[PDB]
Amino acid sequence: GMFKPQGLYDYICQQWQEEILPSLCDYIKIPNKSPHFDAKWEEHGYMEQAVNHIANWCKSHAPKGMTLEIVRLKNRTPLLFMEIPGQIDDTVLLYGHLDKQPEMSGWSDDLHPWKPVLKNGLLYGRGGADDGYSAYASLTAIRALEQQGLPYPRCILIIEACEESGSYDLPFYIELLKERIGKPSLVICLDSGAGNYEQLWMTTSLRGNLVGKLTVELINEGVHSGSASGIVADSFRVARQLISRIEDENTGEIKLPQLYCDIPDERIKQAKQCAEILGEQVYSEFPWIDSAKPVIQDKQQLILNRTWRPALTVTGADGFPAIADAGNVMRPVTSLKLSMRLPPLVDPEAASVAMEKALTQNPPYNAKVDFKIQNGGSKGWNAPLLSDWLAKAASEASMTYYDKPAAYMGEGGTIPFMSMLGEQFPKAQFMITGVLGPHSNAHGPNEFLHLDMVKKLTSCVSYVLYSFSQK
Amino acid sequence: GMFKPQGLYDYICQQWQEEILPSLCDYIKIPNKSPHFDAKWEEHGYMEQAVNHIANWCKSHAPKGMTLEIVRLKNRTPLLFMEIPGQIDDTVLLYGHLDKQPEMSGWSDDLHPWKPVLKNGLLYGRGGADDGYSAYASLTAIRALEQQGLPYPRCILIIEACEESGSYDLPFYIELLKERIGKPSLVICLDSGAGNYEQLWMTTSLRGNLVGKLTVELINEGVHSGSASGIVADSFRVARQLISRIEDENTGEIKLPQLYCDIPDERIKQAKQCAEILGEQVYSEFPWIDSAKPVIQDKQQLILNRTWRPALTVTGADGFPAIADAGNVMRPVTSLKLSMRLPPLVDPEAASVAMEKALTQNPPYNAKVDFKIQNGGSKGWNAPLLSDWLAKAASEASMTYYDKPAAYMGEGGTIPFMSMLGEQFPKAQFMITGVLGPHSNAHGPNEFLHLDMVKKLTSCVSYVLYSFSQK
Ligand SMILES: [Cl-]
Ligand SMILES: [Cl-]
Ligand SMILES: [Cl-]
Ligand SMILES: [Cl-]
Ligand SMILES: [Cl-]
Numbered sequence: 048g049m050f051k052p053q054g055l056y057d058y059i060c061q062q063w064q065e066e067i068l069p070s071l072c073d074y075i076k077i078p079n080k081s082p083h084f085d086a087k088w089e090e091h092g093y094m095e096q097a098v099n100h101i102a103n104w105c106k107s108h109a110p111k112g113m114t115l116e117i118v119r120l121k122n123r124t125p126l127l128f129m130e131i132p133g134q135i136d137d138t139v140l141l142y143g144h145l146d147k148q149p150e151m152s153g154w155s156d157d158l159h160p161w162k163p164v165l166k167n168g169l170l171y172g173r174g175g176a177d178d179g180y181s182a183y184a185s186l187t188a189i190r191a192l193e194q195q196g197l198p199y200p201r202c203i204l205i206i207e208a209c210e211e212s213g214s215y216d217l218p219f220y221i222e223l224l225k226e227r228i229g230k231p232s233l234v235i236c237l238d239s240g241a242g243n244y245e246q247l248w249m250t251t252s253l254r255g256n257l258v259g260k261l262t263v264e265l266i267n268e269g270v271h272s273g274s275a276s277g278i279v280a281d282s283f284r285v286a287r288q289l290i291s292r293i294e295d296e297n298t299g300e301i302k303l304p305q306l307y308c309d310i311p312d313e314r315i316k317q318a319k320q321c322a323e324i325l326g327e328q329v330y331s332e333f334p335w336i337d338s339a340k341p342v343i344q345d346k347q348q349l350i351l352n353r354t355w356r357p358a359l360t361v362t363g364a365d366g367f368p369a370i371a372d373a374g375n376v377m378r379p380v381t382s383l384k385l386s387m388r389l390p391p392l393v394d395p396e397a398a399s400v401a402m403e404k405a406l407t408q409n410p411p412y413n414a415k416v417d418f419k420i421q422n423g424g425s426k427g428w429n430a431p432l433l434s435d436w437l438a439k440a441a442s443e444a445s446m447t448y449y450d451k452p453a454a455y456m457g458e459g460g461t462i463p464f465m466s467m468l469g470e471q472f473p474k475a476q477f478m479i480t481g482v483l484g485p486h487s488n489a490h491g492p493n494e495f496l497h498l499d500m501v502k503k504l505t506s507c508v509s510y511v512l513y514s515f516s517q518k
Numbered sequence: 519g520m521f522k523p524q525g526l527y528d529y530i531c532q533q534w535q536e537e538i539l540p541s542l543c544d545y546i547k548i549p550n551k552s553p554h555f556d557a558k559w560e561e562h563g564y565m566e567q568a569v570n571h572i573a574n575w576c577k578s579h580a581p582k583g584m585t586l587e588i589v590r591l592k593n594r595t596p597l598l599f600m601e602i603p604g605q606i607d608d609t610v611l612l613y614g615h616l617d618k619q620p621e622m623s624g625w626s627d628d629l630h631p632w633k634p635v636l637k638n639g640l641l642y643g644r645g646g647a648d649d650g651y652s653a654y655a656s657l658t659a660i661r662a663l664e665q666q667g668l669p670y671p672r673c674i675l676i677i678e679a680c681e682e683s684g685s686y687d688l689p690f691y692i693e694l695l696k697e698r699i700g701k702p703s704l705v706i707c708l709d710s711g712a713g714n715y716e717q718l719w720m721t722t723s724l725r726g727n728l729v730g731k732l733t734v735e736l737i738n739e740g741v742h743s744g745s746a747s748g749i750v751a752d753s754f755r756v757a758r759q760l761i762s763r764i765e766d767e768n769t770g771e772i773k774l775p776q777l778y779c780d781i782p783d784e785r786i787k788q789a790k791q792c793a794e795i796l797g798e799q800v801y802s803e804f805p806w807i808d809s810a811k812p813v814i815q816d817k818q819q820l821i822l823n824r825t826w827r828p829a830l831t832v833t834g835a836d837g838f839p840a841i842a843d844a845g846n847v848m849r850p851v852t853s854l855k856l857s858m859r860l861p862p863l864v865d866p867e868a869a870s871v872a873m874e875k876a877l878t879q880n881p882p883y884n885a886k887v888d889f890k891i892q893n894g895g896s897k898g899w900n901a902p903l904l905s906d907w908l909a910k911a912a913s914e915a916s917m918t919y920y921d922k923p924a925a926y927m928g929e930g931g932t933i934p935f936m937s938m939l940g941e942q943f944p945k946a947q948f949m950i951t952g953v954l955g956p957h958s959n960a961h962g963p964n965e966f967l968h969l970d971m972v973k974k975l976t977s978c979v980s981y982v983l984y985s986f987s988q989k
């Protein structure tokens with residue numbers, strides 16, 4: 048009778064076109080890099096511009112009874128908080144972020160990180176997809192239920208401004224806000240990936256991440272390499288030898304058992320199913336150069352590599368002159384930034400201790416070796432047992448708006464707040480989902496928000512909120 | 519009777535103190551970086567200042583009949599040429615350079631690369647020892663024989679300005695000057711090392727050197743590492759795997775047989791003797807950090823590692839953000855500058871082909887891999903059979919001025935012109951020697967010229983020139 052699922056989609060599409068898109072485009076212009084990428088973010092004022100821009104829009108599109116506050120702690124990024132009272136005596140917590148990754152290199156000639164460009168049904172620019180859409184879609188999902196005169200639960204929306212720097216500000220806000228937030232029964236987060244743009248993707252796990260700096264030195268100044276080569280070990284050779292203690296150079300297999308966990312059987316089964324759904328799109332849509340290929344061909348194992356196994360990337364370095372600048376001097380120091388994704392269930396403290404010991408003990412040639420972990424190292428997340436009402440709601444929503452079943456897969460990235468919530472609220476259910484499908488390029492050049500996908504996804508969120516109301 | 523060996527030393531010491539040192543100190547102020555370190559060297563005018571400074575001094579300290587010319591080819595570094603006719607119908611060719619390595623980091627607070635500082639009998643500054651002293655000492659060695667009224671051979675002095683960039687200009691000058699230079703019977707080069715500051719060191723070999731850029735890419739833009747890690751091999755892992763094809767990470771042993779030669783037995787014997795002379799000073803005087811140690815403890819083998827075996831150093835890199843700047847993005851490209859010293863007898867072309875094939879064939883994961891060698895890759899040198907007259911002259915000179923025997927050892931660095939001369943003039947004898955002993959720090963911070971050493975060395979050169987006259 049009161050609930051019209053296609054009415055939800057029609058309203059949500061109109062809202063996306065007429066109300067959201069202009070505002071979101073204006074948000075893309077704001078160069079509000081997260082604090083790790085701009086230590087002077089406060090002085091520069093862009094973060095403040097962004098939170099006021101999104102807050103302004105929320106206030107003019109407010110559900111009934113909404114309290115909105117830009118919450119502020121000293122020297123911290125601001126936090127956008129909304130409380131929508133609803134009529135049902137239960138709470139849902141919706142989360143996203145509004146801070147951005149930096150420009151990056153490789154933008155197409157017609158595209159720019161701080162210039163919104165709408166082409167081929169895609170909205171290009173930094174932060175449209177990751178994660179500017181989140182506040183808009185979350186609030187619109189509630190507004191769509193009000194359009195139909197339907198009741199809904201109490202909703203708390205948290206749109207933070209430190210996520211791209213590890214959410215280090217967030218625990219302080221949650222301590223301030225704890226009693227006001229209360230106990231959510233459902234957590235919705237619109238900052239995750241999608242296997243394709245054809246169905247609803249439910250994230251069943253997130254990896255942890257630990258970042259540190261490995262420094263290796265044998266000598267305290269640069270030395271003529273003719274004199275030294277053959278007697279003084281080069282610090283680069285010692286550094287790569289140390290990395291071989293933790294990672295096999297041929298396969299990439301991490302050698303430290305403390306960086307693995309047992310993978311739940313249901314996640315192995317889900318990976319099999321997702322391999323069948325995606326086929327070669329498990330890997331084919333990475334920006335491979337020439338005939339480059341993935342580390343192995345088995346699609347299920349690739350999914351598990353990405354979701355349930357540790358993996359190292361070397362993301363920066365100090366101590367190297369530019370090649371065109373360089374003479375032949377043997378360098379005094381090699382420093383490498385090591386970024387280690389962790390399986391969902393691995394404790395970052397235990398993994399940190401294991402990495403530091405493996406990399407620093409018994410130094411080759413009594414080299415001076417340090418491995419300094421960055422604070423803000425964060426645990427992954429594994430979904431709790433899925434409630435029947437949410438399995439049904441997700442399936443129904445996906446079939447309604449995509450005409451395809453909901454699909455369940457792990458996410459290879461890291462969203463620190465989900466681990467926090469899963470620990471604080473062990474009985475909460477989660478809907479962690481998003482729009483970051485193939486070529487969406489979060490953290491990369493030519494980032495886009497897929498508009499068809501986000502309209503359908505916003506509808507799914509609204510449908511699940513309605514379903515929550517009925518359980 | 520006419521020859522007074524101590525008279526040579528007395529005059530040479532007075533000349534060093536009164537005539538050379540002020541001029542050499544003024545030369546240290548000139549920041550004439552070699553072209554590899556300053557592409558605008560011609561515009562900047564420092565190279566021209568340096569060659570005119572040394573030429574001015576030579577003209578005012580000229581032996582009889584000297585022709586001096588600053589020889590110039592279009593767009594090439596200038597070349598300082600002297601011809602001193604002498605009275606004996608044979609030719610000696612004396613060589614050094616006046617171009618400089620750049621500043622480097624790590625200078626002591628009271629010291630500066632372009633500020634001469636004389637302390638503790640040492641002259642600090644860039645280019646005093648490597649290799650500004652060479653023109654002064656070479657000309658003074660001849661002047662000392664004129665002081666005594668002694669005859670000497672025809673002498674050609676070549677002081678080039680491209681040595682620190684691989685002497686790429688020099689073949690063009692030698693083609694221009696070939697017929698004027700004629701056929702030297704003895705080559706003296708004052709740009710080599712010394713095991714200690716206590717005796718004459720005769721260089722019996724020089725290593726070759728090949729430099730190239732290794733580039734590895736799997737993807738054509740940076741990608742979110744959460745998405746990619748576990749599926750797309752990191753380019754750093756592939757690069758270190760490739761380096762393991764050519765170098766064992768545990769020992770530093772080069773794995774390519776084409777980069778080794780047979781070591782002449784007499785050089786193995788000489789290394790044994792030099793190990794006995796030097797003891798732990800084979801390695802103890804490198805600037806080790808904390809308790810860092812050399813790659814092995816065997817002193818003779820360390821000498822041979824440094825002189826007769828290939829060795830790799832990684833001297834620069836492109837494609838890495840600074841660690842404090844960096845996010846966690848998987849990088850599109852890893853590029854490393856590889857500097858490979860070669861044994862004296864190894865052909866750099868054959869070694870180049872072997873390195874490029876080993877590094878680029880069968881690329882892991884069909885990565886895009888390139889290894890591009892820098893032109894100006896240069897062969898080492900091995901001394902010819904030592905003539906009895908020169909063995910005697912070197913021994914006599916060393917005993918006279920140092921009260922210790924001459925010592926014979928290989929040099930781990932590279933002087934391209936010596937290979938050129940050894941090929942062009944197979945019957946020439948060589949006296950390749952110098953002042954670069956422990957802590958002298960050529961190519962490093964706090965470079966110094968040891969003044970006692972250089973006075974005695976200049977005397978040895980003069981003694982050997984007198985001996986040449988008598989054979
Ligand atoms: Cl910054
Ligand atoms: Cl704005
Ligand atoms: Cl605005
Ligand atoms: Cl760009
Ligand atoms: Cl060097």
Ligand SMILES: [Cl-]
Pocket residue numbers: 273274275711824928929930931
């Ligand atoms: Cl050496």
Ligand SMILES: [Cl-]
Pocket residue numbers: 460461462744
């Ligand atoms: Cl992430």
Ligand SMILES: [Cl-]
Pocket residue numbers: 230471472473474475
């Ligand atoms: Cl709970």
Ligand SMILES: [Cl-]
Pocket residue numbers: 554555556557558
């Ligand atoms: Cl330059």
Ligand SMILES: [Cl-]
Pocket residue numbers: 544545548567568571
């Ligand atoms: Cl001058």
Ligand SMILES: [Cl-]
Pocket residue numbers: 544571
């Ligand atoms: Cl002057």
Ligand SMILES: [Cl-]
Pocket residue numbers: 622623624625626963
């Ligand atoms: Cl310095």
Ligand SMILES: [Cl-]
Pocket residue numbers: 490741742743744845846847848
């Ligand atoms: Cl990333």
Ligand SMILES: [Cl-]
Pocket residue numbers: 240353457458459460744745746
């Ligand atoms: Cl992923």
Ligand SMILES: [Cl-]
Pocket residue numbers: 273931932933
């Ligand atoms: Cl060299």
Ligand SMILES: [Cl-]
Pocket residue numbers: 701942943944945946
């Ligand atoms: Cl000859």
Ligand SMILES: [Zn+2]
Pocket residue numbers: 073099100
């Ligand atoms: Zn605005």
Ligand SMILES: [Zn+2]
Pocket residue numbers: 144177178210238
């Ligand atoms: Zn995000």
Ligand SMILES: [Zn+2]
Pocket residue numbers: 148177211489490
């Ligand atoms: Zn992000």
Ligand SMILES: [Zn+2]
Pocket residue numbers: 239240241457458459460483745
């Ligand atoms: Zn993903």
Ligand SMILES: [Zn+2]
Pocket residue numbers: 544570571
């Ligand atoms: Zn001058």
